[PDB]
Structures are given as C-alpha cells and as structure tokens.
C-alpha cells in the first residue's frame, strides 16, 4: 500500500556520478539488492553519488542500511538534469561496528536526483549495503 523501493534498478532507477566506483564491486548492487554485494569506497573522502530516478517519484522515507557513515550529506534535486540541487538532509549516522542500522528517515519531498555526499565516516572505509526510497512513482518519464 504506497511506499515501493523507488531506489532499484528494478523501478528504472539507476546510480551515477560514482567518486568512487569499482568494477568488481560494483554499486549497480546497491540498486540490485543481493546481500553477497554491496558499494565500498576505494578511499574517497569525500564521496558522493547521485540516484537517476529518471521519473517524478514523492519520497515519504528514506531507508538507509550502512556501516562506519559518519556525515551523511543528503542533497536532492527535482530538476531534468543533473544540476540545480537542494541541501535536503544532512545527518550524521551512529557508528555501527557488526551492527546492522537501518535508518529510517521521516523525509517528505519530491525528487528525480538524490547525490549522497559521504563527507567523512568513522573508518576510512565506508560501504552502502542497502538503500530505498519509501514512497511512490507519480510521473513516468515515457507516459
């Protein structure tokens, strides 16, 4: 009822602008969803990605499932192309050592690109295993 995983390649939401993208782990996972695979940084702090919706989707949560985040700098835009951005939710995440945190985030808004900025983190490494988007598709882009 409402609130379908806007975040997955599945829903024809893929990822870009990877600062750090490796090829054997590749952050096509992220918008994949297999446990065995998830996005780690080969040591870039900064680092930051954008999630093409490629659609008008209307966020109610975000659910972000991460280990050792520190700043998680949340950035959205609802414009056509990747430019023209809002500071949307900067929040910091607690230190999660064998701790699986999924953050559900109370975040209402509408966007068609989201750039997550991983300012810092308490390792220096920081991997993404598992992130969606609560909410539901308003415009498909071809209809």
């Not at 870009?16 to 998830?38: M, Q, V, Y």
């Not at 949560?61 to 985040?69: C, D, E, T």
């Amino acid at each position: 009822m409402r609130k379908i995983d806007l975040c997955l390649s599945s829903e024809g939401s893929e990822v870009i602008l990877a600062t750090s993208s490796d090829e054997k782990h590749p952050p096509e996972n992220i918008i994949d969803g297999n446990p065995e695979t998830f996005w780690t940084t080969t040591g870039m702090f900064p680092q930051e990605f954008i999630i093409c919706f490629h659609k008008h989707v209307r966020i109610e949560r975000l659910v972000i499932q991460s280990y050792f985040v520190q700043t998680l700098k949340i950035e959205k835009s609802t414009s056509k192309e990747p430019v023209d951005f809002e500071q949307w939710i900067e929040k910091d995440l607690v230190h999660t050592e064998g701790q699986l945190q999924n953050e559900e985030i109370v975040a209402h808004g509408s966007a068609t690109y989201l750039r997550f900025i991983i300012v810092s983190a308490f390792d220096h490494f920081a991997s993404v295993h598992s992130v969606s988007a609560e909410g539901t598709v308003v415009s498909n882009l071809s209809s």
